[PDB]
Design a protein around this motif. Sequence first.
Motif, short mmCIF file in Angstrom:
data_model
loop_
_atom_site.label_atom_id
_atom_site.label_comp_id
_atom_site.label_asym_id
_atom_site.label_seq_id
_atom_site.Cartn_x
_atom_site.Cartn_y
_atom_site.Cartn_z
N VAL B 38 -0.68 -23.73 0.95
CA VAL B 38 -0.87 -22.31 1.61
C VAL B 38 -1.36 -21.62 2.62
O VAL B 38 -1.83 -21.08 2.85
N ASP B 39 -0.81 -22.76 3.85
CA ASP B 39 -1.07 -22.35 4.88
C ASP B 39 0.52 -21.56 5.39
O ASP B 39 -0.15 -21.45 7.05
N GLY B 40 0.40 -21.14 5.06
CA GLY B 40 2.29 -20.01 5.49
C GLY B 40 3.16 -21.23 5.85
O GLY B 40 4.04 -19.99 6.37
N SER B 41 3.27 -21.98 5.97
CA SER B 41 4.25 -22.93 6.63
C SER B 41 5.78 -23.29 5.95
O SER B 41 6.65 -23.29 6.05
N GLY B 42 5.37 -22.75 4.35
CA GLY B 42 6.66 -22.78 3.61
C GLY B 42 6.80 -23.90 2.97
O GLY B 42 7.43 -24.27 1.70
N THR B 43 5.75 -25.17 3.43
CA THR B 43 6.06 -26.15 2.72
C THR B 43 5.28 -26.53 0.90
O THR B 43 4.34 -26.43 0.84
N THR B 44 6.38 -27.39 0.46
CA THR B 44 5.87 -27.76 -1.11
C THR B 44 5.81 -29.05 -0.90
O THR B 44 4.57 -29.22 -2.28
N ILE B 45 5.20 -29.89 0.12
CA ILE B 45 4.24 -30.98 0.26
C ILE B 45 3.14 -30.51 1.55
O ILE B 45 3.89 -29.86 2.62
N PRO B 46 2.49 -32.05 1.43
CA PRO B 46 1.63 -31.69 2.16
C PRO B 46 1.81 -32.51 3.78
O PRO B 46 1.32 -32.74 4.97
N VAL B 47 2.69 -32.86 3.60
CA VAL B 47 3.90 -34.19 5.06
C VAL B 47 4.93 -33.36 6.02
O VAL B 47 5.19 -32.80 5.73
N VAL B 48 4.03 -33.53 6.74
CA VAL B 48 4.72 -33.01 8.70
C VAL B 48 4.75 -34.01 8.70
O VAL B 48 3.96 -35.03 8.96
N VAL B 49 5.86 -34.24 9.74
CA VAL B 49 6.22 -35.22 10.86
C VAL B 49 6.30 -34.79 12.42
O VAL B 49 6.10 -33.59 12.62
N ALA B 50 5.48 -35.78 13.13
CA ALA B 50 4.69 -35.41 14.06
C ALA B 50 6.44 -35.41 15.17
O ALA B 50 7.34 -35.95 14.61
N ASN B 51 6.49 -34.82 16.51
CA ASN B 51 7.02 -33.90 16.95
C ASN B 51 6.90 -35.25 18.17
O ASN B 51 7.10 -35.26 19.48
N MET B 52 6.91 -36.74 17.65
CA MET B 52 7.58 -37.28 18.15
C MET B 52 9.02 -37.93 18.57
O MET B 52 9.79 -37.60 18.07
#
Lengths: 469, 469, 469, 469, 99
Positions: B38-52
Amino acid sequence: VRFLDGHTPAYDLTYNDVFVVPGRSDVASRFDVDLSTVDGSGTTIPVVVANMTAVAGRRMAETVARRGGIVVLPQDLPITAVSETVDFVKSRDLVVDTPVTLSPEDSVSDANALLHKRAHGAAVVVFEGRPIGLVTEANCAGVDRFARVRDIALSDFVTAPVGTDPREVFDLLEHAPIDVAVMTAPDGTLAGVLTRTGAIRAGIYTPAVDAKGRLRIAAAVGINGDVGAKAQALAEAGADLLVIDTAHGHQAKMLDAIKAVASLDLGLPLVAGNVVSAEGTRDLIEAGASIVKVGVGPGAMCTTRMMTGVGRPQFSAVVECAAAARQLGGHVWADGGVRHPRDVALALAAGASNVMIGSWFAGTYESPGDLLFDRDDRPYKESYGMASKRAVAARTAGDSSFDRARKGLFEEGISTSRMSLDPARGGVEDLLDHITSGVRSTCTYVGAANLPELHEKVVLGVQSAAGFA
Amino acid sequence: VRFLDGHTPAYDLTYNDVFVVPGRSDVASRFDVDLSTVDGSGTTIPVVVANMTAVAGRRMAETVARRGGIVVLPQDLPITAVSETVDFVKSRDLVVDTPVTLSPEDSVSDANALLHKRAHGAAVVVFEGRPIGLVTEANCAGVDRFARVRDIALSDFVTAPVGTDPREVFDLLEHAPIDVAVMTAPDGTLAGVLTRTGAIRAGIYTPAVDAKGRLRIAAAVGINGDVGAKAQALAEAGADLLVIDTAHGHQAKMLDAIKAVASLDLGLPLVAGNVVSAEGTRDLIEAGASIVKVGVGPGAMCTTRMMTGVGRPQFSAVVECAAAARQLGGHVWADGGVRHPRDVALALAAGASNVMIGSWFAGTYESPGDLLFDRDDRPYKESYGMASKRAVAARTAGDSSFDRARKGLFEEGISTSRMSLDPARGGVEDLLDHITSGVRSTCTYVGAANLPELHEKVVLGVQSAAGFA
Amino acid sequence: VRFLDGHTPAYDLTYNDVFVVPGRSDVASRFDVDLSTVDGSGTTIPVVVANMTAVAGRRMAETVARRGGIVVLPQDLPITAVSETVDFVKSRDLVVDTPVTLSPEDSVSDANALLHKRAHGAAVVVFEGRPIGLVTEANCAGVDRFARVRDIALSDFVTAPVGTDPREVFDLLEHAPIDVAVMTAPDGTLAGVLTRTGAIRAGIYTPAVDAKGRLRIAAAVGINGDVGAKAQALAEAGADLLVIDTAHGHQAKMLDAIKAVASLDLGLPLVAGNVVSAEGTRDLIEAGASIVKVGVGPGAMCTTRMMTGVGRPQFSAVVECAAAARQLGGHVWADGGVRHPRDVALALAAGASNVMIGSWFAGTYESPGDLLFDRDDRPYKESYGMASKRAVAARTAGDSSFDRARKGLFEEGISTSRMSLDPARGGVEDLLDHITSGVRSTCTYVGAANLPELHEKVVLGVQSAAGFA
Amino acid sequence: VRFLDGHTPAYDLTYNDVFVVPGRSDVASRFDVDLSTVDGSGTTIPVVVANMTAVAGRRMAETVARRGGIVVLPQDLPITAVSETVDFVKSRDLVVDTPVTLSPEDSVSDANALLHKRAHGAAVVVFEGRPIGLVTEANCAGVDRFARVRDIALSDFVTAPVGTDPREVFDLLEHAPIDVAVMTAPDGTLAGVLTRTGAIRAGIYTPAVDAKGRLRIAAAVGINGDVGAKAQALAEAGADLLVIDTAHGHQAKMLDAIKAVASLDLGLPLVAGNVVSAEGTRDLIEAGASIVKVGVGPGAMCTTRMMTGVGRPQFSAVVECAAAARQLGGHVWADGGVRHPRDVALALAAGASNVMIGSWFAGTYESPGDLLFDRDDRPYKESYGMASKRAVAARTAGDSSFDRARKGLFEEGISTSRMSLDPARGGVEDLLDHITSGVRSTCTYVGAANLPELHEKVVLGVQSAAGFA
Amino acid sequence: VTLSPEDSVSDANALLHKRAHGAAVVVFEGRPIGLVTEANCAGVDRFARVRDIALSDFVTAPVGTDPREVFDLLEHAPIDVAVMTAPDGTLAGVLTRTG
C-alpha cells in the motif's frame, strides 16, 4: 555522555556493547574535520605509539612525528641512546623522508636487509653525498650474494631540489617506472626522498612540531630508582613528553614518584597510569599528573584477566575517568587493546583526548623488528621476541643470581606473538590513513568538525550479544 | 507495535532479539493471504531488489517484474543503457518468459555460456523466427568446441500457441522428457517459453504492471551533479520509480537534492535514504520524499560498524521510522542485510511497507554476473567483483589522477565476497517462492489476511542470547 | 561485599560476570602480602587439593604440605594405607625434598618409570644409605633395557650437609651441569635433595605444620556406615583435618553424620558439604560443622547441570554462603571448577577462606597417575581413569551382583578426561607459584596486605557477555 | 512457579537461562520418587513418543507401553494398519518381551536383518511353537549367505516357564554365556524372552495398562477431512488416546475440529496443539481439549525460526501455558526439541504434566528405520528419510498433478538428518533409564516424592550466557 | 610365563607378550592359581598385585598325558591353555592345541 532513552544497563560496557546513532550533519566531506588534540601534547592526530621496545623505534618516532603523532621511547634505553634518537628525530625535515642510504663496497645482503626497513621500497646509493642510483625489489634476486652495491645500480631516478611544491613532484612521477622522487639540496648533496602517496600525505597531514620547528618525541621512565634524576636527564636530552607507566598506577609509590617529578617543575606535561577508576584518576591528577592513562586488563580473555580477576571493560572505565578528569581540568588517554579504528573512534567519543596504539604497529616495515618469512613466505614479525631481553637488561639491577631467580620465578613469561605483515598496509603510513579515515568518517556521521564537538554531540546506544551469532 | 507485558528492555532490539507469539487465526491456508503493498509502488509482493550492479540486471528486472516485484537500476549506468533496459522490460509478455535464443552458425561455447544465464535450462535455436530445437544440459559435453549450433539440436519440443490456459500447458508436460513448453505466435513465430513451475507461478502470482499493462521497473540516481536533469531523463525514459541513495541520507545535500527533484513535480513516488532515526525520517518526508529508506550499518560486525562506531540495530530503527512516518502519512523500506525470510517477516511486522534484498540475489543464474566453478565444481559468483569498476567509471568525473588518488586513498576497497549457487534454488524464482512461503506462513501464524492486518494484530516478545548457545 | 553504584543485576553472577576495580594501594611488591588463612586449617596458602584418587597422592601430600597447603585423602582408602601415608608425610623434612631412590641391580625400565614420578628430573642411586650417582634424562636412551642401574651412573653430584643455608646451596649450583644438590646427614647417609627453584621456594614459602613440627595432612570419610568409627580411626591415625563430602550436603543423613562425629568431640575442625544456600550453610554449621564446603554444579554445561537442572553460579553462591557463615562465625570453602588463578582470586574476594583445586592438579608429575605419551609424544594423564575402580572397590559393600547392577544401571559412567602435561609447569610447584603470583597480584592491585583486608576493601563490578565476542 | 529474589529478566527464558537451586530434602534415594502422571493419560512416566513415522513404530509402542510410557501413532497410517498394531500391542505380555522369531528354511541375510531390529541381540528359532536355538552376533560372519537358518543354531539357551519370579531368572543368567532367558508356556510353546537388565527394569518400572490389563497406545489424526469419522474409527479400533496436531494449533479450523470430536463424546481424553500462548491454551481447552500441546519453533536456529520469525522460547511458553491451564483444570505437554534429560526435568519443573520426545528416539534399534553403517561402520539411521513418502501418500488426496505441484512448490523439503546409534544406549530402554535417572536425581535434589510436589517446591534462578564461553 | 604374587600388573603385561602362549600362569608354592590373558590388564589399576584379576578356570592334567586327549579337553575351553603339572601337584609347564 548522552545515551538513548531507557538504555541504562546493569553492567559495564565494552566496545562491542555500544554504537553511535547518526545525527544531523552539515560536514561536506572527511577533509572538513580537524583532528587536533587539546590535551597539550601538541599532536594534530589522536594517535599515540606505545612505549614498548618492539614498536617504539627511531623510524617509528620520525614517521609518526612527521605524520602528526608522537612516540614514547622505552624506559629501559640508556640515556645516550635516547639522546641520539632525539637528536636524529629533531634533525629531520618536515616534508621529505629520510631514505635508506647504502655506501659503496658494501654487501648486497646488507642492502637487501636495509631495503625492507622502510616502506619506500628503494634504497639510494650515496657517494660523497651524491645519489648514484636506487636499488629496488628483485634487484638482488639471482645476483651474487657478495655484490659490492655498485654493480646493479639503476641510475634512472627523478631528481629535484628541496622546496619544490609537491604538486609538481607528483606530476613528474606520473609516468616514472619507480615511485621515488629524490630531493637534493641546492649544492647537489642528497637530502631525502618523496613519493606520490608521501607527497599527498604531506599536503594533507600536519607534522607535530615544538616551538623550535622540530619534530616532537616522547619518552618514558620507570617507577624504580631516582625518578627525578631520570626525568631531569630526559628533559635535558630534549624530550617533549614524560610518561611514568606501570601495571598498577593507583599505588603510593607512583604518587611519590609523581610528586618527586612535579617538584622539579620542568614545565612539561606529565602522563601517568594506568587507572580505570575515578578515585585513581583524581588521586593521580592531585599528585601532579596532567594526563592520566586509562586501561588495565581491558580484554575478557587477556593475559591480565586470565592470571587474575582484576580488570574492567574499557568503554565504561574511559567514560568514568574522562568524566572525573574534565571537572578537574585534566585529560585521559585510552591505553587498551586497539586492533580496529572502531576502538579509536569509540574511545574519542567516550571523552578521551588521545588513543594509544600498541602491538598493532609492531607488524609494519618501519618497526625496529626484523622481517622474516614463514614457510608460505608470509612476512611477519615476532612481537615481544626481544622485549624480554631489554626488560631483563635493567631488571637485573646488579642483584645476585639468587635475587634475579627469586623475582623471575613468580614472573610469567610473555609469549612471542607472531604478527603477520599486511601486504596492502605494510608501512605505518597506510595504517595511519586507515585510522584517520575511520575517525573522519565517524565525525562526518556524527556531524562534528572537531573532537570536542564530536564528544559534545555524540549519542550512544547499547546492543546485545545476540547480534554476534 | 504491541509487546508482551513487562517486555521493556533497556536496549535496542535486532532480528535475533524478537519473536512472534501465535494468536487466534481464521486463515485456512497460505493462499488466503494477500501480499499487495500500500506504499504506492504498485508491487504485489514486498520484495525489492537492491540497486547494485551485481544484482540489478535486465533479466533480474524482467523476472522480478513478472513475479510481482520491482528492481531499481544502478545509478552509474548511462541513459542509453537504462532506456534500452526499460524498453526491453516493457516489451515483455505478462505470462511467458523470454528464452535464450541461439542463432545458427554460432559457437557452441557461446551456447554453453548462454545456457546458464537463465533457470530454464534449455536454449532455443531460432531461425527466421521459428524454433528449431532446444539445447539442454550435457549436450555440449564431448561435442567439438567449434560446433555450429545446428549439429546437436534436439527437435522434440512441445509447441503451443500463446494464450493457452497454463493448466493444459502443464498437462502436455506431464510425460515430456524436457520441461520446456515453447509458446509461439499465431503466425508460427517464436514468442517465449513456459515451464510447469513457471506456469504454476504465473497462475499464483500477479505481475506488477503500470497503467499501460507493461512490467514495472525502478531506477536510482546519485546525489552528485544536477539531480534534476537525471531525474527528468529517467522519467522520460519510462522509469516508474526514482531512488536517491547514499551512505548517510540525513544530510543537507540530500535535502537539497530532494527539494530539487520534487520541484519538477514529475508525479512519481520518490524513495530516499538511508536514515535510522525519527528526526531523519521526518526531515526526509518534509523535504519531499514519499518513501523513506531505513537501515545504516545494521550488523554488529559489518564493514560499516567495524570501520566506524556508527550504526543501529535494524528492528528498533525500522520500528521508530515506521512510527514516525505513518503519522506523517509516509512509508518506510527495510534496507538492511537480509539472508533469511525471517528478516523480511520481522521487517513487515515492524511496520515496513517493503523489504529490499541485497547480496542474497547475487547468487542466482539470472544475475548479470558470470557463473564459475570452484575446484569441487561448486557454482559461485563473485559479489562486488565488477561493481568497483562501474563505481570508478563515474567516480573519475573527468578529474585528474591526483584528485582520483586523493579520493581513493581514504576509500576502503570492498572485498570480492564469493556467493555459492544453491543447487536447489539456482533461479531467483525459487528464492521468491521461499520468501513468499515464509511470509505467508508468518501471516497464517499471526492470523492476518493482508500486510496492514499483520502489522495491526502482531504481538512481539523479547528473548535473551542464552538460547543461541 | 561492596559493588559499584547501580550494579544490581537481576541474575546470579559467575566468575565471568564480575571484575575487580583497582583501588588506592600502598603495597610495594607482591612479597609484602601475607596469604595465611584464618579458618583454623593452619595453611599458609589458600590452596587445597581435592580428595579424589587421581590427585590425592602421597607425593601430593608431601609437596603441598611443604609448600604450605594441605591435601585431603580419599575416603575409599583402607585405614592401613592412610596410616602409612600419614606416617610417611610426618616423617619428612621441612626443607629438603624426598628424592627418587634406586637400589642397585634394579631394572633400568623401573628407573625410567620412577624418573618421571617427581619434578626433580634426577633419581639418586643409594647403596648402604650413601648416594652413588644421579640418573637424569636421556641416560636410558639407547642403553640396554635390562641394565642393572649401576652401569650408567653419573657420579658428579654436588653434596652438602643438611642444615646449610639455601643461599650457599644456590651458589654451589650456579655452574653445575645438573640442577641437583644432594643433602646428606652428618654421618654421610642420604637425607634428601634440593634445587635452585626449590631452595628459593623454601625461602619464600612457609610449610604448614602441626604442633609437633610435622607436615599437616587431611583425610575424608564417606557418609555411609559408622561415620564415628572411621572418624575415630583417622584421628588415631594422625589426621589433622576431617572432610565429610557428598553430592548433596543439605540432607538429613549428613546432618546425622555431622552430629555423630561432633558427639565424639575429637577437637579437630570438621569440613562438610556441599551446599550453595544460606539455609544449608546455617544448618551444617548448627549440626556441628566448623567449615562449610560450597559449590554444587557450578558450570552451565557441566555433567551435573546437563544430567539435571540443579545448580547455581559459583560466585553468588559463595558470596551468600560466606555472608551467612561469617555471622555464625564459620568459614566457607570454594569447591567449584578451578582452571585459572582468576577463579581463586575471585573466590577469595567473595569471602571464602580457602579455595580447593580439583582436576587441574591431575596433570602433573607428582600426581599418582602414570605418565603416558600421545602419538605426538604429548605427555598426558588419564583423569578418572582408575578412580572408578577405587569407587567400586568400596561401592560393592559385600552386596550381591544383583544389587550392584541395580545401583550401577542408574549410575552414569564418568568418562576418562585426558589431561595434557604442561611442559613449562610439569611439577605442582610451578602451578603453586603461578596461583600464588596471581593471588598476590590481585592483593597488590586491590591494596591489601592479607586476605581479610582483601575481602574488606574489595570493590566489584558487573560486565556483560558482549565482551566475550 | 517461584524464582529467586530480584530475578526478573526483561526477556523470555529458554532451558539454558534457568537453573534449579537445591533445597532441603528428605528423599533417601532415587527409588523413593513416584513418577506417575496426573494428566489422565495413565502413564507412570512422563515420557511420550512423538507421532512421526520414523519413531512411532510397533516395537516402539510395545516397548514404551511395557516400560510405562505411551506412543502416539502416525495420522497417515491406514485404519487397518492401526487396528493391527493396536491388537498386536494389546496381545503382548506385561513382563516378557516379544523376541525375534525365525522360521526354518529362511535366508540367513533375513536373520541378520531381523537381529538388529531389537536390543535383545539374539533371535530365537521357532518350529511348531518350540524354541530350537538362539542366533547371536558373529554367527552370520563367514557363514554362507544362503544359509537355511537351521545350520548355525546354538541350542544352549536357558528355558523357564512363564510366571517365574525374575529374581531367580536373574540368578540362572549369572554364568550363562548368552544373556537370554527363554520364557515358555506351560505346554512348552514359546512365549517370550527375558534379560538381566530387562528383568530388573520389569521389577522397577510399572507398565501403563488400561482397564482390561493390556498395554496402552495412542493415535493421531489430521486436521483435514472428516475428523469425527477418523476419531470414531480409531476409538472403535481400541485407541486409548487421540492427538490432533498441526503446525499452528491456534486456528479456527482446529477449534472446529475439536468441537466436532468432542460432540461425539467418546469419553477419551483429547490432546491438541500446538500453542505457546495463554489465550491459545484457554481457547483450546474451551473448545473441548483436555490436554494442550505446547511448543512452536522452540530453537533459535531451528528450521521454523529460520524460515519465519515466528517462535517463542520453550521454558517461558510452557510456564505460561501451564499457569493458564491449571486454573482451567487442564494440562500441558512439552513438545519441543528434547536432546538431554535436563530438558525433560526443566519442563516438568515448569508445570508440564508430560514431556514428548521426538527425533532423539529415532536413533535406536527398536525404531522402524533400518540400521546402516557409515564408512567407519558407524551405526546410524536416516531421520525423516521415509517420512516424506508417507506424508505425500496422503497429501495427494486424489488431486491432480497440477494441484500437487502447486502445493509442493511452496513446501520446503525436510532434509534427511543422519542420527548415529549410541553403542552404549542402542536400545530405547537404555535411554529410558537415562531419562528416568535424570528426573529422579532432579527430584532428589529438589526434595520431592512426586511430580506435583516437585512443581510445588521448585525454586528457579536465571543465569547469563557468559557461562557458556 | 610365571608370575609371583604381590608383583606389579605392569610387569605381568610386559611378561605376557614375551611368549606366544598368550597367558601367564600365576604360581604360588609351585601350584598354579590362574591364568592372566589378554585384556585382563585393561582398565585395571596399574598398581595391581597380580592376585586380583586371576581367572582360575584352567584345565589341568598330569605330565605324560597323550597330547591327543590334551587336545580333546581343549575343544570347548574358552582359553587355549592346558596346564601340565607334576604328579605331586607342582607346576611343570603348559601345552596348546597347536603346540
